[PDB]
Amino acid sequence: HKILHRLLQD
Amino acid sequence: HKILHRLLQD
Amino acid sequence: SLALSLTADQMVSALLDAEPPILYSESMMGLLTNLADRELVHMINWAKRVPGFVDLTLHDQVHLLECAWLEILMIGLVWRSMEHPGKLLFAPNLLLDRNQGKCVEGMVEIFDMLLATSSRFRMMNLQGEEFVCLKSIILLNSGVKDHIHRVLDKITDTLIHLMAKAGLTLQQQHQRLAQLLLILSHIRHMSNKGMEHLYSMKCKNVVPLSDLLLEMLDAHR
Amino acid sequence: SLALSLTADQMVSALLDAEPPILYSEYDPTRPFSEASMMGLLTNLADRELVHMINWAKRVPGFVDLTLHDQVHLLECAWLEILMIGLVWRSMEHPGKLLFAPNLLLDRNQGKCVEGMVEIFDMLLATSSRFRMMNLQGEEFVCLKSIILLNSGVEEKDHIHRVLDKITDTLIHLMAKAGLTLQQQHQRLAQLLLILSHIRHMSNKGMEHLYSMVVPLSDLLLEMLDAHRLHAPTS
Ligand SMILES: CC(=C(c1ccc(O)cc1)c1ccc(O)cc1)c1ccc2ccccc2c1
Numbered sequence: 458h459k460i461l462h463r464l465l466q467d
Numbered sequence: 468h469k470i471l472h473r474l475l476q477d
Numbered sequence: 478s479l480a481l482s483l484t485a486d487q488m489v490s491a492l493l494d495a496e497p498p499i500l501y502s503e504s505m506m507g508l509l510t511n512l513a514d515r516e517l518v519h520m521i522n523w524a525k526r527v528p529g530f531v532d533l534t535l536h537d538q539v540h541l542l543e544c545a546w547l548e549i550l551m552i553g554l555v556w557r558s559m560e561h562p563g564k565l566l567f568a569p570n571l572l573l574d575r576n577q578g579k580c581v582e583g584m585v586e587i588f589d590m591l592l593a594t595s596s597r598f599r600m601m602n603l604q605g606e607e608f609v610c611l612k613s614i615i616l617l618n619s620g621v622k623d624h625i626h627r628v629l630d631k632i633t634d635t636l637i638h639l640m641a642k643a644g645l646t647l648q649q650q651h652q653r654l655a656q657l658l659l660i661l662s663h664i665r666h667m668s669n670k671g672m673e674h675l676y677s678m679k680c681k682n683v684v685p686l687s688d689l690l691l692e693m694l695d696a697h698r
Numbered sequence: 699s700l701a702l703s704l705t706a707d708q709m710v711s712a713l714l715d716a717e718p719p720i721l722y723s724e725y726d727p728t729r730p731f732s733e734a735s736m737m738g739l740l741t742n743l744a745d746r747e748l749v750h751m752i753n754w755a756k757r758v759p760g761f762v763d764l765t766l767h768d769q770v771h772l773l774e775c776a777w778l779e780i781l782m783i784g785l786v787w788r789s790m791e792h793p794g795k796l797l798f799a800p801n802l803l804l805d806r807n808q809g810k811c812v813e814g815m816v817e818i819f820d821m822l823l824a825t826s827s828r829f830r831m832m833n834l835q836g837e838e839f840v841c842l843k844s845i846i847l848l849n850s851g852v853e854e855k856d857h858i859h860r861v862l863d864k865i866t867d868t869l870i871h872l873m874a875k876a877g878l879t880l881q882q883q884h885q886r887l888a889q890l891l892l893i894l895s896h897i898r899h900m901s902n903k904g905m906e907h908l909y910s911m912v913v914p915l916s917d918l919l920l921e922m923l924d925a926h927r928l929h930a931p932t933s
């Protein structure tokens with residue numbers, strides 16, 4: 458869940 | 468031999 | 478050969494003619510295994526009646542069938558389930574819904590995907606003439622310029638011919654063609670997960686797969 | 699609603715500029731090598747590749763127009779597929795070998811000592827061989843790869859559908875520009891997509907091996923794997 462969400466927001 | 472092998476023959 | 482000798486219309490007739498029948502079922506995996514096993518016998522003679530499949534050597538026929546058998550079984554199920562939103566028509570007497578998928582591992586996950594695919598065909602207004610073309614492709618594309626590619630081109634030309642007949646424009650033809658072939662990827666996926674669970678519950682000694690299913694299964698593993 | 703307006707040319711350009719780089723492994727050419735952790739190098743490679751893929755996908759026309767969850771779902775389902783098509787793409791010029799990195803070239807015999815490698819290896823070669831004989835072009839490559847991203851997701855995703863049609867029209871444009879007849883454009887379009895199914899096949903084989911079990915998978919690589927857990931596999 459988390460990690461992919463964070464990497465999709467730059 | 469194998470069932471698939473035999474059926475393909477006839 | 479033979480396949481490369483047929484016109485587009487003659488190719489369609491041969492495939493519609495080659496069509497295997499809809500069977501009836503005879504614990505959930507037991508009924509599905511029994512049905513599948515009986516379906517596989519029809520599929521083999523169906524394959525032999527697919528133009529260009531007999532041109533191949535016996536060795537290549539075994540490979541392609543060992544590779545596509547579950548894919549082909551699934552596109553059949555999906556096809557005849559179209560008139561039943563939210564339910565799967567394995568047989569005219571065995572119409573299962575998503576919920577019948579529980580108890581047994583992986584079935585509800587695979588059911589969802591099969592249902593999804595069925596809705597996709599439903600929205601695309603898939604036709605029988607298109608359906609038999611896709612089934613033939615799956616058979617020829619399961620493995621692994623040459624013969625098989627030359628036949629796949631003939632079937633593609635046939636699909637294009639069918640669409641043009643339906644009244645589709647050139648632009649609508651390559652889009653729909655693309656749309657159809659993309660769904661085949663989902664079919665490959667569902668089949669992969671199907672065999673994966675199949676082999677697992679085979680190891681777990683749960684479902685008694687028939688001899689024919691045991692052989693096909695080990696052709697992957 | 700901006701990808702739906704892009705012409706075929708400016709569609710290829712957007713995808714071409716979205717292209718992630720080719721990375722290198724941590725392999726050392728000066729010292730002897732051991733196939734006791736090819737999977738370690740591959741894992742480290744795949745992990746670093748994923749980050750670049752994530753941002754590449756965000757530069758795929760129409761992808762951002764989706765919600766996170768959709769973007770997440772597509773990435774979770776297609777990450778290994780996309781890695782495997784890029785790998786196969788750059789392995790065309792090296793028959794019988796897989797070019798994981800310009801410093802990490804792999805032959806069939808490395809396919810040994812490591813379980814599942816051989817089978818997947820031979821599958822990757824065949825796909826590369828098919829692409830090689832089909833003479834796959836770079837413009838076509840980025841098109842097919844973006845389709846995998848948008849199609850691997852097994853109020854209507856009709857947005858994705860309109861974008862899929864877009865990419866399709868783009869491919870036809872390339873083939874027409876190449877000089878293919880209408881029949882050849884159809885046949886070639888068909889063949890390229892048929893090979894995508896094999897890419898689906900190989901990815902699924904790679905998956906069940908990967909989450910069977912050093913191997914020191916990353917935090918992120920564990921996520922992309924667990925998405926293929928209970929949503930599909932088999933305890
Ligand atoms: C859906 C399915 C099977 C099936 C496919 C087509 C058809 O016309 C009838 C049944 C099936 C195939 C072989 C079997 O031995 C049993 C069922 C299928 C495939 C794999 C599955 C794996 C886990 C759970 C359910 C499954 C159902």
Ligand SMILES: CC(=C(c1ccc(O)cc1)c1ccc(O)cc1)c1ccc2ccccc2c1
Nearest residue numbers: 740741743744781782785813814815904907908
């Ligand atoms: C081929 C492959 C991996 C890979 C794919 C693309 C790429 O650019 C680089 C490497 C790979 C993916 C994830 C990993 O954690 C490790 C390698 C791959 C995938 C699964 C395998 C399973 C068993 C044996 C070999 C495998 C290789």
